[PDB]
């Protein structure tokens, strides 16, 4: 019965994907980043290590979070497929922007300047071919269904 | 409700105004514009409509004609050409973007008339993804599943 | 009217069809409606019978090709640019499904269908857009079929 | 039950028989192989397995790797390295199709031996077409909009 609920709960959960950049071996190194859909948002979750790997505990924790608008999501589908080269999301309590890397084809860099009235906290992911590639078919996904093509 | 995606101009100057839509039942793209009806609206609740529907530029386009678009944003083509009684227009891949020209008429009048719009940028990917999606539901798949 | 447009609609085998009406040569014209029905890959064939215009049906059945869930990936393949060609060997029709040298991304569907000994042709070719329909629809048709749908 | 696509490398020879089941739990794959037991077993009403399941390989992926194992097939990455205590593969594109070799292990037993697997031809159009769609219905999505 411990899979006799993952059919239960799957019909239920917000979709999403997550970015593993775990890094024991020294931490603020790990993180990990959490995209998601709920209602038309585009929800970051970014989380700091805590406890190391092979061990016990929580592993990670929620920090920063972004809520990006349905609007904003062809726009990075503009950048992911090769148009725009920058786009930039202006949240109340996160702005941020989201660009090609140059040390590497097909990959890019999603950095931020979270306001939080003062001072300001920095944090940055970097999404490899498929990390990148995985962000694309996930916001294919959801203009496709949230443009209404599931009735 | 049909799937769709608008594309809401309404600009100082009414005669200028364009609410352009593009929806697709079925195997059927199609393609309309409303001109704006009026100045910008400036009470909350004045639910009256900004858009002036006995004006509309809506046009029609073949389960195949999808498939041409779509070919057009794929590259598969450089352009396709659609003569009919009712309208003659290209869809061609701009540099920056997507366009649609031609000669068309509005509604309840026999004037035709120069026509075209332009999908760019953002505006493209948008554009680009619908049509790929509808040619992907255009065939009556998901649906036949239940 | 266009309600009942939809639990009806609903019920109907996927498909679309590949329309090549002679204006001139009635007899030059032929319909092909590709679809799909449990696994099966149906391909119906028509000649056009009536005129463009004329107040009457225009569409005519004729034979009727039924590739098996398996070319699904093999049709596909000459369609992407791997396979070279494929064939179909119905028990009565026999088919080649191979890209056409005129134009790039375009296709065509060579046939003869024997029936008890009946010796009859048709060659129905694939455009861009076309060959790019059939591509998607059987896409669909592999990726729902294999599940997915679930 | 789960989407899958098989291949029944059947021969007269058990000893190089083998089956290659490749399947999809929400977000990883499971490429699984199971060697031919028993003879070529003839009878379809033969309910019984024709494959090893106690000699069977089973390698559960990681979600990003449904990425990469994709983006081979795109071209974007000439290969794949994915490397583990229980395993070692490199997924590289090959001539005739594609190609997963390293180094695995099945069941209950310590033995990292040589593996080599081919997806060639009309199968390597289904692994393609198999992989772009199960990392499209990994996110959940469909299964949610129910």
Redesign the interface.
């Known amino acids: 019965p411990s899979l006799a609920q993952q059919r239960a709960r799957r019909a239920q959960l917000p979709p999403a994907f997550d970015v593993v950049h775990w890094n024991d071996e020294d931490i603020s190194r790990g993180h990990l980043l959490r995209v998601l859909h709920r209602d038309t948002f585009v929800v970051l979750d970014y989380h700091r290590q805590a406890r190391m790997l092979t061990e016990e505990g929580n592993k990670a924790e929620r920090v920063v979070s972004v809520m990006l608008p349905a609007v904003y999501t062809?726009?990075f589908?503009?950048v992911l497929?090769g148009?725009?080269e920058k786009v930039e999301v202006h949240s109340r309590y996160t702005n941020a922007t989201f660009t090609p890397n140059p040390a590497a084809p097909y990959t890019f860099t999603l950095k931020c300047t979270s306001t939080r009235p003062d001072e300001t906290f920095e944090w940055t992911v970097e999404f490899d071919v498929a990390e990148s590639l995985m962000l694309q078919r996930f916001l294919?996904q959801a203009?496709?269904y949230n443009?209404?093509?599931?009735? | 409700?049909?799937?769709?995606?608008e594309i809401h101009d309404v600009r100082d100057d009414p005669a200028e105004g364009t609410m352009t839509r593009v929806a697709v039942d079925?195997?059927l793209l199609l393609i309309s514009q409303y001109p704006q009806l009026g100045p910008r609206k400036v009470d909350p609740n004045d639910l009256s409509p900004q858009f002036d529907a006995d004006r509309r530029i809506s046009v029609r386009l073949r389960?195949?004609?999808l498939?041409?678009l779509?070919?057009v944003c794929?590259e598969?083509?450089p352009r396709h050409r659609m003569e009919t009684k009712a309208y003659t227009l290209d869809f061609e891949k701009s540099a920056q973007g997507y366009h649609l020209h031609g000669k068309v008429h509005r509604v309840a009048s026999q004037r035709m008339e120069d026509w075209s719009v332009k999908f760019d940028?953002?505006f493209?990917?948008?554009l680009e993804?619908?049509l790929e999606?509808?040619?992907?539901?255009?065939?009556?798949?998901?649906?036949?599943?239940?």
């Open positions: 062809a726009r589908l503009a497929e148009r725009s294919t203009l496709h443009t209404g093509f599931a009735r | 409700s049909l799937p769709k995606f079925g195997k389960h195949v004609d498939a041409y779509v070919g794929k598969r083509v940028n953002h493209a990917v948008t993804h619908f999606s509808a040619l992907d539901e255009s065939f009556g798949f998901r649906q036949h599943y239940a």
